[PDB]
Short mmCIF file of C-alpha atoms in Angstrom, two decimals:
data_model
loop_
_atom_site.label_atom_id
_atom_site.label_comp_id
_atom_site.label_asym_id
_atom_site.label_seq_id
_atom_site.Cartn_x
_atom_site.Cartn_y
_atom_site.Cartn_z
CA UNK T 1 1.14 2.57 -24.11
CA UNK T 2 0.25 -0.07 -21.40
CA UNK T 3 -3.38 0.82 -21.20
CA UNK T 4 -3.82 0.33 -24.73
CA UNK T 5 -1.21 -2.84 -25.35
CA UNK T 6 -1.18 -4.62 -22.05
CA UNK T 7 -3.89 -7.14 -20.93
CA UNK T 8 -5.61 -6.24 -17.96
CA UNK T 9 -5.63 -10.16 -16.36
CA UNK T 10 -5.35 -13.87 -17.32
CA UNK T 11 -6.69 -14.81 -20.51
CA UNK T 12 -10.58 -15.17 -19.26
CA UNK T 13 -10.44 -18.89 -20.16
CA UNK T 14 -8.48 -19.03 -17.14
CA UNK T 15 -9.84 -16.73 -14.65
CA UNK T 16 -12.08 -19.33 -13.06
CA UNK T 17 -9.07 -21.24 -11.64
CA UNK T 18 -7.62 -18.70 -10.09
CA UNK T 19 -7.91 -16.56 -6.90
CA UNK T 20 -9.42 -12.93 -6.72
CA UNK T 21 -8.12 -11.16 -3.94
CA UNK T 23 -6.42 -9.82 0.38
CA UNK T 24 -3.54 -11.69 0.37
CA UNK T 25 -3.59 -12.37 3.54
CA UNK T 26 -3.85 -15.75 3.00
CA UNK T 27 -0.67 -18.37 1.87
CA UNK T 28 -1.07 -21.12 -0.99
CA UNK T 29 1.42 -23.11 -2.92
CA UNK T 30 0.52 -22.92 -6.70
CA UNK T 31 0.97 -19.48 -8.23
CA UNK T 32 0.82 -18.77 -12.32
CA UNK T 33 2.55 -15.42 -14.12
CA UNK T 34 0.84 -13.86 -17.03
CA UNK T 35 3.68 -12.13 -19.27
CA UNK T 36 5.93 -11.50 -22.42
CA UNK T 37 7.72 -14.37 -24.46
CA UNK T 38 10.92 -12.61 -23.33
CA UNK T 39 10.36 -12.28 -19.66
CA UNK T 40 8.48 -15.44 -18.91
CA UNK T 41 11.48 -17.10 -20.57
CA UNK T 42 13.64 -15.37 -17.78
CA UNK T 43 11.36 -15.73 -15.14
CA UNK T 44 10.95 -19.73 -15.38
CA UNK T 45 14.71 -19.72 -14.56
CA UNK T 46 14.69 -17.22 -11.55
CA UNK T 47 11.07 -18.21 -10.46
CA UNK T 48 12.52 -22.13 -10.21
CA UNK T 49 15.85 -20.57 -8.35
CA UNK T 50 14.08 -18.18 -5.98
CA UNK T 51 11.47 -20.62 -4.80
CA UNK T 52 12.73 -24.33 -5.36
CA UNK T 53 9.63 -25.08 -7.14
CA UNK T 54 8.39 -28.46 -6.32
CA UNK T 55 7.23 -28.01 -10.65
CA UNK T 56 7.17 -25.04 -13.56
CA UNK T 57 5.84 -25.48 -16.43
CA UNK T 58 6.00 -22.67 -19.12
CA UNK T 59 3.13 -22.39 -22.13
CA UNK T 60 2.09 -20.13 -24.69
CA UNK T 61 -0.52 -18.09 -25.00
CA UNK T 62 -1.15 -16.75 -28.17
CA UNK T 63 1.74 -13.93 -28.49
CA UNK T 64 2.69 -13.84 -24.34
CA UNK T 65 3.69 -16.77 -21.99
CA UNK T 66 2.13 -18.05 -18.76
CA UNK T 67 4.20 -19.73 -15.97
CA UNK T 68 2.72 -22.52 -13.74
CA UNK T 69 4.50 -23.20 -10.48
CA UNK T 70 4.23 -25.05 -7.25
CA UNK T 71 5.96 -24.24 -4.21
CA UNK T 72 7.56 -26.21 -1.61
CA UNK T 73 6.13 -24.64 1.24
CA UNK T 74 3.41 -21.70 0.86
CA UNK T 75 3.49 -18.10 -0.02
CA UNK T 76 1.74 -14.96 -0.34
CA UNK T 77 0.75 -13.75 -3.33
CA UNK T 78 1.55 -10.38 -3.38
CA UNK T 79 5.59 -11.51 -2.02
CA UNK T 80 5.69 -13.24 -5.32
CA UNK T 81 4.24 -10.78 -7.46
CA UNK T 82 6.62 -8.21 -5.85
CA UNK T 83 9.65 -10.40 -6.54
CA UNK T 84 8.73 -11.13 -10.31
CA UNK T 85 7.55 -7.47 -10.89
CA UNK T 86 10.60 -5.88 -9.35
CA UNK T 87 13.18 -8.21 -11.58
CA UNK T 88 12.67 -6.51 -15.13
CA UNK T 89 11.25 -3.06 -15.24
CA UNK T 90 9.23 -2.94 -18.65
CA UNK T 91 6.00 -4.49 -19.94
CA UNK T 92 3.30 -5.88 -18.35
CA UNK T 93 3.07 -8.75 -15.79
CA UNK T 94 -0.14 -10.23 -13.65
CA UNK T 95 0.51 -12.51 -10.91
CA UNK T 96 -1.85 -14.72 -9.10
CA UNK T 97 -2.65 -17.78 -6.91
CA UNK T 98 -4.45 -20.91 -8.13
CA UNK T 99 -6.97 -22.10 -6.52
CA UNK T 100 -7.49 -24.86 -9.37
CA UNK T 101 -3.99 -26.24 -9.30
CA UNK T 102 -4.95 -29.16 -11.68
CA UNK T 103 -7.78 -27.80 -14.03
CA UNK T 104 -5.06 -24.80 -14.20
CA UNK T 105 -2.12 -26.79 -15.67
CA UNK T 106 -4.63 -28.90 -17.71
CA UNK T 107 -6.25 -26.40 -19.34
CA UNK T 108 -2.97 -24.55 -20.01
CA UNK T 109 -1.65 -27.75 -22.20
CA UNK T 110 -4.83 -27.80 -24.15
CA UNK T 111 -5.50 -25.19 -27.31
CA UNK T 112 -5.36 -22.56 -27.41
CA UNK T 113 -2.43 -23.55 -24.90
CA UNK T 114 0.77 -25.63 -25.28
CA UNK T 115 3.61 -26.40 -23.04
CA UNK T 116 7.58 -24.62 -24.43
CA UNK T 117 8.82 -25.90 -21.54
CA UNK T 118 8.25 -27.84 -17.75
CA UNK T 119 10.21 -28.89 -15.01
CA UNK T 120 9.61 -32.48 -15.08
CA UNK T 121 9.77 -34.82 -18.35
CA UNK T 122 6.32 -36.17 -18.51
CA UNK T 123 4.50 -33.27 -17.16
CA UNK T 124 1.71 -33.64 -14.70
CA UNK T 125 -1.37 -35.54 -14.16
CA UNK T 126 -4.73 -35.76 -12.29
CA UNK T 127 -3.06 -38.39 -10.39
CA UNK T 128 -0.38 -36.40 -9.25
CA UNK T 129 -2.72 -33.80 -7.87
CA UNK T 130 -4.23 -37.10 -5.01
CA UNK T 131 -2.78 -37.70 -2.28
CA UNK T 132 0.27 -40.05 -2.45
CA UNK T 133 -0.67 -43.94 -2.33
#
């Protein structure tokens, strides 16, 4: 059952980047912790739903993660309700990053790897300062 079988959060190497709680506030990078199956869905109706600026999809271990940026900002808990409310079964966690760059990096580094991303090329610390 989900208790047993379902993590609880990000993979800890993670957590650090990310926000913890009151979503009261609006941000623009957002990351989904999920299934193989669903985050392959999701990249598709995450990039449709929000025009994503970027999405990047990687694996972790035997699940996905999702790495997005927003055009314009969102609350958390309106994108968590949209992703959770689109497939029914298994386990999904939802957050904001607060570490937009150390986020993605980290997340194309073991034990991450990118399946699949938005732009050819990726992203770079470069693209995360302000345009020249």
């Amino acid at each position: 059952g989900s208790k047993v079988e379902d993590p609880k959060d990000f993979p800890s190497e993670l957590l650090s980047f990310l926000s913890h709680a009151f979503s009261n506030r609006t941000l623009a990078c957002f990351a989904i912790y999920t299934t193989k199956e669903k985050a392959a869905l999701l990249y598709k109706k995450i990039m449709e739903k929000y025009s994503v600026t970027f999405i990047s999809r990687h694996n972790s271990y035997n699940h996905n993660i999702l790495f997005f940026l927003t055009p314009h900002r969102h609350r958390v808990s309106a994108i968590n309700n949209y992703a959770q409310k689109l497939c029914t079964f298994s386990f999904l966690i939802c957050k904001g990053v607060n570490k937009e760059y150390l986020m993605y990096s980290a997340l194309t580094r073991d034990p991450f790897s990118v399946i699949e991303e938005s732009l050819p090329g990726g992203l770079k610390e470069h693209d995360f300062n302000p345009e020249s």
